[PDB]
Design a protein around this ligand. Structure first.
Ligand SMILES: [Ca+2]
Length: 223
């Protein structure tokens, strides 16, 4: 996250870190046994880390649970990043409380102008690299589809939305991928892609979760 603020420990209780020997992507806990992330975060051998603030220090609220199954969306296209969503089933159920909690799926899509919270452990610089150890947060609005399509001609599908600031300076970045965009207490987006980070006229692009609720619910019910 570029241009954000330190969230505070366990203030974003649905935020997960995906670990394969190191943090590589975020995700969101949607019930005691399932996480949703980005398909471009797929790899084998994932450990899901819940209850984290400092990802390099054991602080006492963590739960480390291996993945038993990963399911990439059937229509994910790695070239265009259309349908950039993936479900991860945990080997055992997480223990839920105030510091580790699930986030609700949306019943309706959010409109442009709605303010959302984006979080992650990704890069904090737009030029160069500095990775934080503690979770960072950013408040940003959903942008209109017309502004999003004007920023990225020919690249925005109906399964994507833009959020952030056309003036630059505040965005999600590398290492935030897969993490949550939460608006009015519901998971509306997944950190997916962008052209660089925090550049003028190049806001972040997010997977539009409201289009996938039926697929998520049906998949969880049968796996
Ligand atoms: Ca920790």
């Amino acid at each position: 996250i570029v241009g954000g603020y330190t969230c505070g420990a366990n203030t974003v209780p649905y935020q997960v870190s995906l670990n394969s020997g190191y943090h590589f992507c975020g995700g969101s806990l949607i019930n005691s046994q399932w996480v949703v992330s980005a398909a471009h975060c797929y790899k084998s051998g994932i450990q899901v880390r819940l209850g984290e603030d400092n990802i390099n220090v054991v602080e006492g609220n963590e739960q480390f649970i291996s993945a038993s199954k990963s399911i990439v969306h059937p229509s994910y296209n790695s070239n265009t990043l259309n349908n950039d969503i993936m479900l991860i089933k945990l080997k055992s159920a997480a223990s839920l409380n105030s510091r580790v909690a699930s986030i609700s799926l949306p019943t309706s899509c959010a409109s442009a102008g709605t303010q959302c919270l984006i979080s992650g452990w990704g890069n904090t610089k737009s030029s160069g690299t500095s990775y934080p150890d503690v979770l960072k947060c950013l408040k940003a609005p959903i942008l209109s589809d017309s502004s999003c399509k004007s920023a990225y001609p020919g690249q925005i599908t109906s399964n994507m939305f833009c959020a952030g600031y056309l003036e630059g300076g505040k965005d999600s970045c590398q290492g935030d991928s897969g993490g949550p965009v939460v608006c009015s207490g519901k998971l509306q987006g997944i950190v997916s892609w962008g052209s660089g980070c925090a550049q003028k006229n190049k806001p972040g692009v997010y997977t539009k979760v409201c289009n996938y609720v039926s697929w998520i619910k049906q998949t969880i019910a049968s796996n």
